[PDB]
């Protein structure tokens, strides 16, 4: 129920030793020889009541309360109560044996945390870290995971909720022991678990703010100390993040329920970034932990990251479910809150279009995945599950469930359901119980939609029937759906195409259009799959069939992830893309028209007009540009009208010019190959003349788009590889890239263009390159440690690019990865090394077999012995799973 | 443009303005030769402003003055079209010819580096004042008035800086040597007598008199001496009774 932790002596020596006075509530639990979670630490006494007794070390197992030397009068007696308190005992509370339940005690024991404790960045201030901050250490220890064992000796389970106090020395404190402040923190009312009990020792500077805002820096587009916190810096970043986080926190707090936190401030620790820690936003105890990205490209990235972090922290810590399989529920609520707040605050690329693009990307990335309801356990699994496909799959299920009927039952059901669990079941929640209550209070069923939706889905055939009834004006029509389809059970121990993943067909909306593409709606029940319906009351094709009845175009929720297929492709795509009062319908019609066939001059003029329309945003303009780029010819190659029109139109800027320059640059310089004079003049003229019409401060978009366009032009147009100065163009591009990189990385300062330029140049070159200077250049740069963002990029690029010979490459890479351990070098070196080796070495069964064969042929040098004998904490778990999967 | 210029200026300041030992001479010579052999005149304004500020707020030791004089001599001797429009020989040559605390406070007696630096400053300032065809060096009246006012006001930088600067500027600019060397009538006795101040530097006074007599001692002088004999009675007998002027001229001409 209570806890008195006393830590100290953590800085300088990078250690943390102190006593621990745990106060049980637990009431029952197990008692006696408790299995306290610990790591590579040093024990320090273990008294209890009177003296001590036997106890095991090691999984810790300290014995307590075993003999009959204690007294049972305290547990057998009872005090007076009021308001029907009861508080009765029984044989467990009394009886006369060990491991009694419903008993109260108070244990104490001193612990010592050395510098060899895995799972906590320790960097004392004494000629061991760096010249910056010499009188201040840095031992930030993660919390979301299993760091409790390495930070102290206690339980690390999730089925036991109990409170604890935070009275450490680094209420209100000041002078206590000379230069020590006894920081007392009650918190004996609300209780938590063991997985969220860390000690992130970071900077003391707290750059918090409030929430009152209206203009300040030309904005925009009962509180708490919001903002962030850095090492005496991050003024502008703390201001912007304080205003945005203040408005979002106020809206979420006023549209959600409650919140027991008052320190809505992040931080910029030096140990960033990390996989499941410094990724976007960390959730600890009224304090955010963000990486060093104050001058990076934000907009939708920083916005979606902050919104998802706030929603996840407000919906992932308020309800404590008994089952850890609530990833779809927490991710769904967080995605809904972040989507509503972002839609009510941000509005430039169309919220509906952004949601549609996210759903399409989630479907494409989930077409070949596994299952949602995985088998639960332990930071790599949490980070992968939280940043995998669950976030993109929870939005579709949440939107489908919330759109299956009325929104009143969903909003009122969730708001009223949250108060029941938040008022009376803090550690008794259940995802199955919540889903059952929601389905029972709002319509029913949902089993086939939840299980079937989380299993798999697909579709690739849609037939339509047309029937004209002139005797009574009955325009019958048919709609049929068909498909042509030919660790989770240890990576699927067997198989199975489905066969029918989508059970119920859900709602079948029939938005039939009248003559000249009108806007008629229809509510088709459908339900059962493979059914029929019935309805009633150069341009030779369009001229002869201008208006006959009703051109019922495609939809309205995509119950079976959905491809369109029906007659009138050109007429339906043109009428739907040129006459439609829905952003989703316009985008779908534009995509279908760009992916199908139509006219040449008409399609180019209509596409240019629609892409240049003021009503269109980044999604419409980018969609039209992508379609015109993929189809810049009815049957030839390039389109002079489309290319000349885009170049002439392209010649505060803002999202229009920023989004048009990137799409036109990465899409313009494609294959080409032939005509090295014109191609080299356009690509070289754009690269050397970049920002030659409106150069200012916004250079990240032009740098990324320019690097991508150059890499795509040199790779696509230089893949084969001089009758047209091909060698001169290649040498000029290589010299220009080398001089630009040496100038931007030598007598300059950057970090948002050097990595993209180096990666784009290396990826564009690759084969037929310099044999061999990659190893000496990367080894010299990494050895010299130039710029914080350069070593990881060079190591990952070299490890992911090499392959031939490989003489001593495994030993050099192993020593470099084992010696360069920190934050971006450790995380980026481990993740980038594993992903680079796997991608470089290698349908699934065939690939795995090939990799195994390659490993067998090159079994020499592994470790395994060494790599595994060195991997600890996160590297021990991740290296254990990955190592076991590679063995 | 704003990035390369700042990078070069800072690289020279950290460099150039820095110091070393084994690579100090090689770095200074390589930098002066490179800046005075390649590159361009884009770094002429920054280098002139930094050199003028450091030379105007420094004046310490003899190493800084020698390095600045060598760099200015190399850049000015191998520069583009910017020195004439910027006009720097007036302030640079004026401060270098008016300096005295650098040597005095930094090796006053036996200021060999001060003498060599004075000769080099007289050569550079002389060439800068002589590189004029129409009006690129109209500082003759200001320099003459400044030297006359300084000599008639006190003994600032006495005695060799003003004589070397004026002698070099007049000799190099004489394209005016007679008017510059004459000026007035009785000037030697009036200058020495007006100054003096119990000059305890016998070797310095004798060296200055001998240097002035040798520098003043020639087509007209050779023709007049060969046709007569330097006018022993006229110069003697006639003229004034300058013991140092007549004795120095006779001893130097004998």
Author numbering:
A (entry chain A): 36 to 93, 162 to 273, 331 to 381, 395 to 597, 605 to 666, 686 to 736, 785 to 898, 930 to 999, ...
B (entry chain D): 218 to 258, 260 to 305, 307 to 436, 449 to 485
Question: Could you give the paper's own sentences about this structure?
Answer:
Transcription of eukaryotic protein encoding genes is initiated by the recruitment of general transcription factors together with RNA polymerase II to gene promoters to form the transcription preinitiation complex (PIC). In vitro PIC assembly begins with the recognition of a specific TATAA promoter sequence by the TATA-box Binding Protein (TBP) which is part of the TFIID complex along with 13 conserved TBP-associated factors (Tafs). A striking feature of TFIID’s structural organization is that nine Tafs contain a stretch of amino acids with sequence homology to histones, including the histone fold (HF) domain involved in histone dimerization. Here we describe the cryo-EM structure of the yeast Komagataella phaffii (formerly known as Pichia pastoris) TFIID complex at a resolution of 4.5 to 10.7 Å.
To further stabilize TFIID and reach higher resolution, the complex was incubated with TFIIA and the 105 bp TATA-box containing K. phaffii glyceraldehyde-3-phosphate dehydrogenase promoter (pGAP). Single particle cryo-EM analysis of the promoter-bound complex combined with local map refinement showed a significant resolution improvement for the two lobes interacting with DNA while the third one remained poorly resolved. The compact tri lobed KpTFIID architecture is stabilized by a topologically closed (Taf5-Taf6)2 tetramer. An atomic model of Taf2 residues 36 to 1194, including the 4-subdomain arrangement of the aminopeptidase domain (D1-D4) could be fitted into the cryo-EM map. The linker between the Taf2 lobe and the Twin lobe is built from two copies of Taf6 HEAT repeats (residues 213–486), thus confirming that Taf6 is present twice in holo-TFIID. The WD40 domain forms the core of the Twin lobe and coordinates the arrangement of the three HF domain heterodimers. The cryo-EM structure of yeast TFIID rules out the possibility that Taf4, Taf6, Taf9 and Taf12 form a histone octamer-like arrangement but revealed instead a hexameric arrangement. A continuous thread of density suitable to accommodate a double stranded DNA molecule is located between the Taf2- and the Twin lobes only in the promoter-bound complex. The promoter DNA contacts Taf2 through two arginine and lysine rich loops of the D3 domain of the aminopeptidase domain (residues 733–742 and 646–652).
